[PDB]
From a paper:
Here we address this question from biophysical, structural, and immunological perspectives using structurally related lysozyme proteins. To understand the conformational basis for selection or counterselection of cross-reactivity against foreign and self-antigens during antibody hypermutation in germinal centers, we used a mouse model where the cross-reacting foreign and self-antigens are well-defined lysozyme proteins. To investigate the impact of conformational flexibility of foreign antigen on antibodies that cross-react with self, we analyzed mice to track and sequence HyHEL10 (Hy10)-derived antibodies on single B cells responding to four structurally similar lysozyme proteins. The results show germinal centers have remarkable ability to select antibody producing cells along novel hypermutation trajectories, transmuting an antibody with no capacity to differentiate foreign from self into highly foreign-specific antibody derivatives, exploiting conformational flexibility in antigen and antibody.
“Self” lysozyme protein (mHEL3X) was expressed on the surface of all mouse cells under control of the ubiquitin gene promoter. Superposition of the structures revealed the backbone of the self and foreign antigens to be extremely similar (rmsd of 0.29 Å for 94 Cα atoms) with differences primarily restricted to surface side chains. In response to self-lysozyme-SRBC a very different antibody VH-domain mutation, S52R, was carried by 60% of Hy10 GC cells, including 30% where S52R was paired with Y53F. Bio-layer interferometry revealed that the S52R mutation, alone or in combination with the Y53F mutation, abolished measurable binding to the highest concentration of self-lysozyme tested, representing at least 100-fold lower affinity. Thus, when foreign SRBCs displayed a protein structurally identical to self, the Hy10 trajectory adopted was mutation away from self-recognition. Following [name] self-lysozyme-SRBC without self-reactivity, few Hy10 GC cells followed the affinity-lowering S52R mutation trajectory. Instead almost all had acquired VH mutations Y53D (84% of cells), Y58F (10%), or both, that increase affinity for [name] (self-lysozyme).
Author numbering: 1 to 129
Write the structure that this text describes.
Amino acid sequence: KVFGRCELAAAMKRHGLDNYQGYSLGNWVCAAKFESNFNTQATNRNTDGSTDYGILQINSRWWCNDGRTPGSENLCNIPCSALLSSDITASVNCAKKIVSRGNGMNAWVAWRNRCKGTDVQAWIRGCRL
Ligand SMILES: [Cl-]
Ligand SMILES: [Cl-]
Ligand SMILES: [Cl-]
Ligand SMILES: [Cl-]
Ligand code: NA
């Protein structure tokens, strides 16, 4: 599913990401824009042999099981394919664990490099939330 911007904002708010670990909703929408272009089906292979999955490009080494990432932890206890669903619940639950870990949203390199320090509230402008 390719979410609309306000559609994704509403879903992330409903699932409790607005202000989660102090990160306002626009941070999460901006992260999703640059990680996945709002596409739940996005996948991208990393140089270490892991793969990133879903709207927030969650990685198979630490977080989800894809059956092909040797030495993988599955700290979210899900199959990585759960992260490609039109239902963002599994991505949100796993993102909450990731962002709680100690480096916060710096875990998402697209967030560091294209959202951090910017006017992220622009990403929820116009939305009825
Ligand atoms: Cl929308
Ligand atoms: Cl957009
Ligand atoms: Cl915001
Ligand atoms: Cl959803
Ligand atoms: Na894994």
